[PDB]
Structures are given as structure tokens and as C-alpha cells.
Amino acid sequence: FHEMREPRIEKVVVHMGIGHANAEDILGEITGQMPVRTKAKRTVGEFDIREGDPIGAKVTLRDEMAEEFLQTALPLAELATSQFDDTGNFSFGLDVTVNLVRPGYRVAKRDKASRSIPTKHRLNPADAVAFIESTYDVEV
């Protein structure tokens, strides 16, 4: 009952919202895998008219690549309460977001018969704080 209910890190996305790059360099070095250009929709007076055009980069980490990153990332942030998502996700920080979920998320991410995860099976802030807090650090 528990085994297929206990949280896990599905992905940790680390991106730098610049606005016009050289940044990709450090991300690859801090994460362990290639970066990703980040374009933008709509035009802004902030000389940011070019719809499609580099502006930032990101990296989606999974499995060890994500843990080995948190084993040093987390230690550099004072996790708080309000810093948590309604689904048990939290973003701190250079941006570093952590997506937490239960063992059957693939049901909502696969192509065939895909379905959305029932709320009861959804993660909660508490359940999130718990899992994480239970891994070398403190909550609030």
C-alpha cells in the first residue's frame, strides 16, 4: 500500500531566465548534461520583440543526474513552507525546481489510455516536506 505511494523525484529542471547565452556553459558543468535554448512568445517594449530567439536555457534532470545535483544544490538553499506547490513541488534559487510525484505518474504522461492522476493519489505539501525533509536537511 505504501511502496506504491511513497514520493520520488521525477525531474529537477534548472534554468536561467536571462533575456538576450554564455550561461549555457555553467549549467552543463553544474548539472552534467547539455542545456536547452529558451525562446519566447509575444513581443515586449523591453527590446524583447524577437518572438523566436534565445533568452534562457534549461536542463531537465532525472534519476541519479537529478539526485547527484540535489546532493549539493539543496545544501545551498533555506527551504521554506510557502515555497511549496499545491502538488508537492517546490522551486528555490539561477532557478532550480523539483517535481515530486507518486509511482504511477506514467498514467498521465504516456500516449495510450493516458489519464489524469486522481487527487487522492496526488501529492501534498505535507507529504512533500516529509519525503524531502527526510533527506539531510530541514523544512520551514
Add this chain to the structure above:
Amino acid sequence: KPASMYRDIDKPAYTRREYITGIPGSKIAQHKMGRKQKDADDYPVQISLIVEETVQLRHGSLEASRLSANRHLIKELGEEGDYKMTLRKFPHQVLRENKDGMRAAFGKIVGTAARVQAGEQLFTAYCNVEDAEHVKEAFRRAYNKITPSCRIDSSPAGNA
């Protein structure tokens, strides 16, 4: 101009403001009068003015008859008497006037009016049993300022 020019409901319904422009503002000062903070259910007596013929009443008449009626109440039951009268109809029908002779005669916008079906209640007042004769007089004055003949109908009030 005479109401003889607009009292009949023979033209199409003409109310779509997304297609009509330059509609004159309504002269109707207010629809809810008396003590509008109180409820109509807080009164024992409820009398309404009922239009006996389906017609069109221009905003100028509604105001005139509403005014002459409420003004009476205010005068008899003081500026803050225990009562509340309501004008339930709003002048949605836009009016034209062709003011070339019959050439390109679609008239220009000159006003608004409310279409009232016979049997409907134009006004509805609410008072205590000791004011019925005043609200009845207010209504009498009001129906002298609109085209149709009307009934001063007493609804909740078996205190006769």
C-alpha cells in the same frame, strides 16, 4: 412631440446597441424609491399600477408619471416615509424620426420607450395599512401621465 407618434407597438423590436448609435440618455431619474434598504416583504400592503393596454411609454412619460407619483408620497409620508415604490420597466426600445422627403427616410435616433403588455404592472408600491389611500392617490396621478387606462390593483391587503 406627441406620444401619438410612438405609443403603438407596430415596429420591429429595435434595441441592439451594437448597431444603433447616438441613443439619447434616459430622463428616468431612478427606478427604486422610498426606503430601498428595506424589503418589499417587510410590508403588509402592496399595490401596483397595471397598464390595461399594450403600449409604448417614452422615457419622458415614465419619468413624469413616476415623478408625479413619488413626489406625492414624499409630500404625504415625508421625505423618508415608511414605504418603497418601484418602477419595474426600463425603456429598451429605441425611437426614430425622419427629420429629401420620403427619400432615404430611415429616421435618426430621437429617444427610447418601454414596451408594456396589457395586464402588466408598471409601478409597484409597498406601504403600511395606514398609507394605502396615499399610494393609491399617487398612482392615480401617475396614470394621468401615460397613454393607457390603468387599474390600481391591491395585492397583499385584506385589510379593507
Add this chain to the structure above:
Amino acid sequence: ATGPRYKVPMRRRREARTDYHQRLRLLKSGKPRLVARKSNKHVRAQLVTLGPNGDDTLASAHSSDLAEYGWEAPTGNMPSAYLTGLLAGLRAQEAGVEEAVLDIGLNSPTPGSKVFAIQEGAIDAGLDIPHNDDVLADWQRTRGAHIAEYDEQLEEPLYSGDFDAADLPEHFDELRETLLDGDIEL
């Protein structure tokens, strides 16, 4: 859901099981559909035709009823797929069916995939189906050579149950051979 004006997808679209846009281009041929479906453990192949109250299945084959002929290995891989296609293809032939168009449902047209395998099989059973040879996997991978050579990087059995250690794509040959043979009770 929300109001009288709300639009609810066709049931099989809510279920995310049928792609009606592809279903249409597919039905246009006028030929029976060779439905190729997968499971985590199994592979299915059906020959479907249009009917007054829903589709009619004229012949099918499931990777499981493959054992009914000697298959003693897993039933959700390439050799398994190909064979399930050939089997369904043979029954189809028996049913008077001669041609069909490959319907892979919500699966991806990835080169060398199992659906194209189910396709190569049905085709070999003698069924004419619009196809493209170089989108099919090379003969060896259909046999199971990719899995055998994988067990070479052994150190530990690729198969838990006791079905050899280095596996046998020969079993594939022996099975195919069995189906091609005129006898075999379809």
C-alpha cells in the same frame, strides 16, 4: 460537464484509445484493417472489417496462444510479434481474407518496431498489405538475434524462468517453420 453547451468527446476519445482522424484515412481504403496492438507482456493482431453495429473481427492471433504451437519463450518481443502476425495472417487466409491495411493505432511508426513486425508476418502468411520494406527490421532482429547477443553480455541469465541461458532464435525458425507447414491446426 459544465453546461448544456458543453461538448463531451466521443467516448473512445475520452478513453484515449481511438484516433478517429486516422481511423478515417484508414477506412477509406475499403480493405480490412490489420489491427496491430501491443501489451507489456503480449502482442495482438486482428483482422477487422466494418460492420452495421461496430467492427467485426474475422481473424486474430494473440502472442499467448502462440505456445499452443510450441512457443516456450516470452511473448512480447520481435520474434513473438512477427509470429503472432503470421499466425493471425494464416487464419485470415483461411477466412477468405486476402488483403488489408496496417492499422497501428496509437503506436509510433518507428522503423523496425513490432507493429511492422506483426506486419511482415501477416504479409508472409500470404496477405497483401501496402508496405515499405526498409521500415521493417532486418531478418535477424526479427529472429531475436538482438536478444541472444544481449545475453552474451551475460554474467547473469537474461531469462529468469528456465528457457535456456543463451536463448534460441532457432526456436523462432522452428516455430515459423511449423506454421508455414500445411498441417498445423489453425
Add this chain to the structure above:
Amino acid sequence: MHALVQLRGEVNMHTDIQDTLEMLNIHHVNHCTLVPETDAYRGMVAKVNDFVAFGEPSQETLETVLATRAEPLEGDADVDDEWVAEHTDYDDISGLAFALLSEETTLREQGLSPTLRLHPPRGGHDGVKHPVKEGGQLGKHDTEGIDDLLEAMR
């Protein structure tokens, strides 16, 4: 089985109404026909409802009118019991009448003109501007009502 009688002329009456009166074999004022009571026929008489007088006649009444105004498909031949017998599947007028009322046969199947060309109503009718429920003479009638009319147009 109802008895149809045109009481209002063709001038100014709708064509589709006039064509119905003709499909019911009536082409003149004061002419009468005997029509079965079917869904189809009901539709037709309802449509003609305002220029006709109709209802179910009494066996007797029918007999009187048949004897007095029935005609062969051709010729002046008077339709009397003998005629009726020597030409129809019946022995007399009452036999025929009964058949008509019970919608077992039609004036045609017996070689009779489908129309009873009646005479103007002795004493006059109740007016062609109002229906029966209003003192008029138009529309559906009681057997006692139709009878009076038919017998007066004897």
C-alpha cells in the same frame, strides 16, 4: 360515415379547399356526398369544414334522400327499390343505405353517381356565416341536425 353538403360557393374560396371539395366529388353548391370515416377522409372534411355542412345521417333520412336524389352513373333513371335491386348487391334502398352507413360499399361500386344533388333547404338554413355552435349551419352536426338539413333539402 358522414354526409357532406356544400353550402358555400367557390368564388373566393382557397383553391386547395376547392380541389378537396372536388376530390370529394362535389362541384356545386347544395350537392351532397357520403364519405367514409377514415384518417384521410377526416383530414379532407376538416379542411373543408368552413364551406360545408356534415354529420352522420339517420338510416331513415339517408333512405329518403337516396330514394329522392340518388342517380345512376348515367341517365335520369329513378333509384327506387326495384332499380336498387335490379342493379345493386341489395334488395332495396334500406339495404343499400344500411350498407353505406356501415361503410361496406359506395355509391360508385353500385353504379350510382357519387353525388346527391339536393334541392335548396325548404324554410332556409341557419346561415353560412356561423357554425352550428353559434346558430349557424356550417361545420359538424348531430344526427338530428344533419337530418333536419338533409330532409329539408329533400
Add this chain to the structure above:
Amino acid sequence: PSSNGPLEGTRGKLKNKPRDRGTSPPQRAVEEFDDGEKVHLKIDPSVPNGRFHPRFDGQTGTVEGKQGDAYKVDIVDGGKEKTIIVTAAHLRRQE
């Protein structure tokens, strides 16, 4: 009319009630008819192709062969005979 195009005055007949909105089921789009078959004509608001002139919505013709995948349906406009090229999506069997 203020203009005389094909879709003139077809706001109603060429629009779906909110719930019938969205792609139509493929079944009737592939139905097969045989010559002599009486078929009702009615454009499906959701299906662009294979339509006929809106004036003919409501007609009940007689299938008489086909052209490509579309059918050739015979009807009578008023008193004039016409042949309409229409696909199954916009047809229904009579009775």
C-alpha cells in the same frame, strides 16, 4: 438578399448546435449506397469536403452511380432535374 453567394442565408442550416460541435464520426463518412437507393441530403456542418449547394439541403434524391468516392445523386429542383455530386458524410438512407 444583399449579396448572392452560395452561403447567403445559411447561418442556420450550416451551423451545429453547440453539442454536435467538433469532428463527426467516421462511420457515416464511409457508408456505401447502391444505385436506386433513396438518400436524404443534409450537409454536415463539421465536414468541409464533399458538400453540395445549400439550396438542396432537405432534398431526398436517388443514388445513381458515383464519381471518385463521392456519389452522384439525382434530384428534382422544383420541376428541373439535377444531378448532385455529394459524399456519404452528407447523406443518410431514407427509412
Add this chain to the structure above:
RNA sequence: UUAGGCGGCCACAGCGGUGGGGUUGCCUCCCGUACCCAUCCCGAACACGGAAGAUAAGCCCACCAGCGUUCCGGGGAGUACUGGAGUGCGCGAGCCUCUGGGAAACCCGGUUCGCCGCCACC
């Protein structure tokens, strides 16, 4: 159908919710990247290979009507509107009678938490 595949009708099937169900069986989640194949970066997905674990998701089964929907009863209502007729009424706007049709809102109470077809299958 002790959990499957393809559908038809496309909400009576939607939204929300409760209970139940799986040792070599089924569907899954699940385990895992040498390969076919794959991510503008991630075996997440897609694809491939596989069974240590699980029934918590999904799914299947039984059920709840609060919302949305379908239909029915009673009431609203033979009201509103209306095809045909009138030397009926009304200054008139308009109304009325006869004949043939006949709503909508809303309320109260029932119904509906899908139906059916082909194939496969302890």
C-alpha cells in the same frame, strides 16, 4: 469480458464521490537500456528487453445524484403562439367565437453515475 482488443450510438455515457479486486493467468503501474528506435536537453515520452515488487494510480466490478445531461409523471397549460372560417366586438391599437394544431420558463416527484456489436479469453 477474475481485469482484454476493435468498435457503434457519441453526456442516459459528463463533473464529483464511496466501496471492492489480482502468486507462475489478463491489463497495468513496475524493472531495466546491448540492441531497432528516441529526446532542438532529459530511456520522462517514444522504442526496445524484461519480471524483483504492487493492487497505491489506471483499468474492471458494485454503488451514491450534489452539479451537468436524457426521458417520464403531475402542475404550469390546452395557457403563449398558430393553419382555416366569421355582416362577432372594439374609435382604434386590438380582441373574441368556431375548427385543426400546440409550446417555453419554472416547480414538485421519478429516471439517468451508459447502452449495444464483433473477436479473444477459466
Add this chain to the structure above:
RNA sequence: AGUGCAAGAGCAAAAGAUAGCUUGACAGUGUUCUUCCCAACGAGGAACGCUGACGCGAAAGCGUGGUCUAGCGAACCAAUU
């Protein structure tokens, strides 16, 4: 929301978006509807075929320009293939 532009209509594993490839905005010749309801009338328009050659796709298939209804012009003469 978006879908070039009126208005009305169509569209969600798309008709929208992004990416990539591509030139079917192809030649020839028809059927049918429209222009012109019914009911004769040209240019123009559209729908739907076929022959030939191609593009894309695993394939069914899609592409006879733009999601649909506006964006058009006779004879004589000239230039052009």
C-alpha cells in the same frame, strides 16, 4: 486562442502551434452544381473525377493554392508558348 482581411460559419491526438521536408499555386481533359431557385443566358467560380507527371508519408492517404462564402472582364488587334 489561433486560423491574412467583412460578416456569418468550420476546426483541438486539428483546419491551430512548432519543426522539417516539398513545389499539386503541376500539364491535359471532363462530369456536376453555380453564376441565372423554380426556368432559358456568357465570362467568372466551385465541387467531384479521369489521364500524365510529381511531393510527403510506414501506409491507408492527402495535395486540382490559402478552412468556407468576395478578390473580376467578350469580340477585334498585339505580344508571347
Add this chain to the structure above:
RNA sequence: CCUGUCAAACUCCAAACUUACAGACGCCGUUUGACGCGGGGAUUCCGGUGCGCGGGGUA
């Protein structure tokens, strides 16, 4: 929540009614040949009124 009104270019609804095709009855046609086909000859393209439904207009 409670409370007051509307729509030619609004619609969750929705008639009467008009309309395609078919069957049935009726009526009509098979010496009065209908339905349809081909051909000759026109006149006509200032209309008006009542009723129902209208759009414009104070009328």
C-alpha cells in the same frame, strides 16, 4: 446571495407551418392519350384591391 428589465442583425429551448421523397385513400389518364417530348404562333415585362405576414414612414 438577494432584487428590477430586454434583443431585426442573442439562443439552453421551441411551435403552428412550409417543404423533399415514399406508401395509402381520393381524384385523374389509358377511343376525351394524361405525365412527358419536339415544333409553329403569340400576347406580356405601367397593374390594382381585400385579407394574413410584413420593412420604411407621424401619417
